[PDB]
Design an enzyme around this catalytic site. Structure first.
Site, PDB file in Angstrom:
ATOM      1  CB  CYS B  46      -0.876  -0.023   1.254  1.00 47.08           C
ATOM      2  SG  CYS B  46      -1.918   1.461   1.571  1.00 47.08           S
ATOM      3  CB  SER B  48      -0.013   3.762   4.416  1.00 50.13           C
ATOM      4  OG  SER B  48      -0.975   4.800   4.276  1.00 50.13           O
ATOM      5  CG  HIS B  51       2.696   7.808   3.032  1.00 52.24           C
ATOM      6  ND1 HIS B  51       3.184   8.356   1.863  1.00 52.24           N
ATOM      7  CD2 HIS B  51       1.347   7.927   2.965  1.00 52.24           C
ATOM      8  CE1 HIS B  51       2.180   8.788   1.122  1.00 52.24           C
ATOM      9  NE2 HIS B  51       1.055   8.536   1.770  1.00 52.24           N
ATOM     10  CG  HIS B  67      -1.416  -1.044   6.249  1.00 50.81           C
ATOM     11  ND1 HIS B  67      -0.371  -0.567   5.498  1.00 50.81           N
ATOM     12  CD2 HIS B  67      -2.542  -0.632   5.616  1.00 50.81           C
ATOM     13  CE1 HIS B  67      -0.860   0.102   4.449  1.00 50.81           C
ATOM     14  NE2 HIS B  67      -2.184   0.104   4.451  1.00 50.81           N
ATOM     15  CB  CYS B 174      -5.297  -1.885   3.832  1.00 47.87           C
ATOM     16  SG  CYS B 174      -5.107  -0.011   3.756  1.00 47.87           S
TER      17      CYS B 174
END
Ligand code: CND
Ligand code: CND
Ligand code: ZN
Ligand code: ZN
Ligand code: ZN
Ligand code: ZN
Lengths: 374, 374
Positions: B46, B48, B51, B67, B174
């Site tokens: 993902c 994130s 990030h 996640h 997710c």
């Protein structure tokens, strides 16, 4: 009085910003196709009219402000079909043409025929209906209630019960409708909830009235004017808090008070800082924050987007989310049946001529709603 | 490997930001009371998790990220009653303790036991479970899925269908759930509505997916990466726009083509500017804008509050508004019942060992979801 030609009367002209209103003799031209001439009877002074003078709300000058009133139909224009001479009425600063996208939408009420997003200060014809000296004066929100006689487009006027006390009922032209509607209509306050209302003026007190109607459990009033706390409590507040009594930010105080944050918070003042403070003070995961006050012309606010990412909903609303024509007469009826009180909002009543005094009472903090009679 | 004590295995540890993952050997400790040790089968990459490497998402390093995944229960700790060794499961980055105020609330989903608001990088008891070299390593959102084995608290794990295809169902961890939920659950897209979705990656495409499911009549996709278009139209987008092709602001464009603005806009990129552009491009009196992307750590965005005063509603959401534990099982079921397809989001499937290559693909723009297999 009587007519079919230009009426000459007194109006409260504002020629420049930060200056007192000049009550002068204006020439009010007859209603054209689909317009109505109304003989004013009472007008409440709202902070938005004050924003015009201080320059926070930019609209063209010269102008005749005013947007919260009740009057009587003096004449009717070619094509009018909704009102008749002798009818008690309420001007509408937020129109309802019934044809645009929003009017069609079962929820939206900010009619595309409004003069608020980009003020021209006119009649829909794109023309004025007032002249002072020899110069034409602008209209405010196509309402301009600080005048003995004003003319409104049919789209912007609503017929009210002939037994209505125009002096009480004018609050429904703004103050109460905007405030009460924010609670019940736009935020949809639930029973047993906990709310926080920033700003205890005439509109703010109305929001509190709506939370009580909506069954809220706790209603925390917030204001830097301790004197407001009595009325607040008298109309529903379970407690009031003064930010200045504290050594920590009011959000922290509010979150802790409500063990985690408020369910519904409302900004009913009109400044960048309280708008964000009100957002932050509500529950991070499902709190609703409604911006009710009118901010200064071209000012942006800074905020952290993570406030939303967590699950918070932030809204804004004009006129309480109410579809104008449909709602004001239905509201006036509920008043008649005694389902809510307006008296608590009314602190003063002065003759129209003492207009400048009424604004002084506003700005000093001794009043909530001061009603000007004609 | 099965056990009752420490399991020595492989994993990708991010020691320092803006650096590749190091695939090495960690010691995964047995689960304490109310904890579950899980053998991972597949994980999605993902944005994130990226990030984290870029430092846009601050969480204590060294860390084991990840996640969105799905695996099988290798062992459980004392007191566990919702899963058993052999069960297929999905670790939830958004917990569901069922006891806190958000969990008891009908609409809230952001459990008060989450490690996202204030990331400690640990577990419920404040202790890690990973040791690399000799030093303890941090947990990420309580899941840390980029590891052959991981341990999660009972509140962050859901049991899913024993017949479910794990290298598919991992996207419900997710990407899909968060994107699909943002439309269906959060914004609540209405049939016939005109939608706009900024960002066409795995999460964006899933938002498009949900808009279609909601009956959106028009779903416009916006991206600066022209190559994303085909896959968008493919999963539901009616049009596709590339801001870089116009000589005027994207909101002007979007408002014109939608004749005065869209009904619902979603920001699924993670930028301050587009969260505002998304807000402005929707209808002023009743438009709704949902923020799905994750912004850079402590950056504030500027915006004009009149935008909200008009009538707009601004929201944000984590995991598509989905109460984690009860929804994940039900979403897997709908998958089994062919209610939605996850296949269009999967462009690559690499061995866990090639996690770096997966991230490079993400970053180079030619991927949506890369599934890493154990
Ligand atoms: N959305 C709409 O349709 C709309 C319609 N009419 C008025 C409004 C706006 O609502 C706002 C309130 O109007 P009103 O009730 O007539 O005003 P009024 O001016 O009576 O009340 C404002 C209140 O806020 C209080 N206040 C000021 N500063 C602070 C502060 N910094 N922190 C806490 N409290 C503070 C102040 O004491 C006062 O009691 C104002 O901006 C007005 O323009 C909006
Ligand atoms: N809310 C949640 O629970 C949640 C969970 N996981 C990830 C997210 C966040 O969702 C966001 C997207 O995740 P993803 O789908 O994996 O990412 P991915 O990179 O696959 O999607 C990003 C897309 O946005 C596009 N884009 C970049 N700049 C622009 C721009 N200026 N204008 C328009 N489009 C642009 C870009 O080309 C790419 O196609 C991201 O910010 C991630 O951190 C949210
Ligand atoms: Zn007002
Ligand atoms: Zn209209
Ligand atoms: Zn994600
Ligand atoms: Zn919880």
């Amino acid at each position: 009085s009587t007519a079919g030609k230009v009426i000459k009367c007194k109006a409260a002209v504002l020629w420049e910003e930060k200056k007192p209103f000049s009550i002068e003799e204006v020439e009010v031209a007859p209603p054209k196709a689909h317009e109505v001439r109304i003989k004013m009877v009472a007008t409440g002074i709202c902070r938005s009219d004050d924003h015009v003078v201080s320059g926070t709300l930019v609209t063209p000058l010269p102008v005749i402000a005013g947007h919260e009133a009740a009057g009587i139909v003096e004449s009717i224009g070619e094509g009018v079909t909704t009102v008749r001479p002798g009818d008690k009425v309420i001007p509408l600063f937020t129109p309802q043409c019934g044809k645009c996208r929003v009017c069609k939408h079962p929820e939206g009420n900010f009619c595309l025929k409004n003069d608020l997003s980009m003020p021209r200060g006119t009649m829909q014809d794109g023309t004025s209906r007032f002249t002072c000296r020899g110069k034409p004066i602008h209209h405010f929100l196509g309402t301009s209630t600080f005048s003995q006689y004003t003319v409104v487009d049919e789209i912007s006027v609503a017929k009210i019960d002939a037994a209505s006390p125009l002096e009480k009922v004018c609050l429904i032209g703004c103050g109460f409708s905007t405030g009460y509607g924010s609670a019940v209509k736009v935020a949809k306050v639930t029973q047993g909830s906990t709310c926080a209302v920033f700003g205890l003026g005439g509109v703010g007190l109305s929001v509190i009235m709506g939370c009580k109607a909506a069954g809220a459990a706790r209603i925390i009033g917030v204001d830097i004017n301790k004197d407001k706390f009595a009325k607040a409590k008298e109309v529903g507040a379970t407690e009031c808090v003064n930010p200045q009594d504290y050594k920590k930010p009011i959000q922290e105080v509010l979150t802790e008070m409500s063990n985690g944050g408020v369910d519904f918070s409302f900004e009913v003042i009109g400044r960048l800082d309280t708008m964000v403070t009100a957002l932050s003070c509500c529950q991070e995961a499902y709190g609703v924050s409604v911006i009710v006050g009118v901010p200064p012309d071209s000012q942006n606010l800074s905020m952290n987007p993570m406030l939303l990412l967590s699950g918070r909903t932030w809204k804004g609303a004009i006129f309480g989310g109410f579809k104008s024509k449909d709602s004001v007469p239905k509201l006036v009826a509920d008043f008649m049946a005694k389902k809510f009180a307006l008296d608590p909002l009314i602190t003063h009543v002065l003759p129209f001529e003492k207009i400048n005094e009424g604004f002084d009472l506003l700005r000093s903090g001794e009043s909530i709603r001061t009603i000007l009679t004609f």
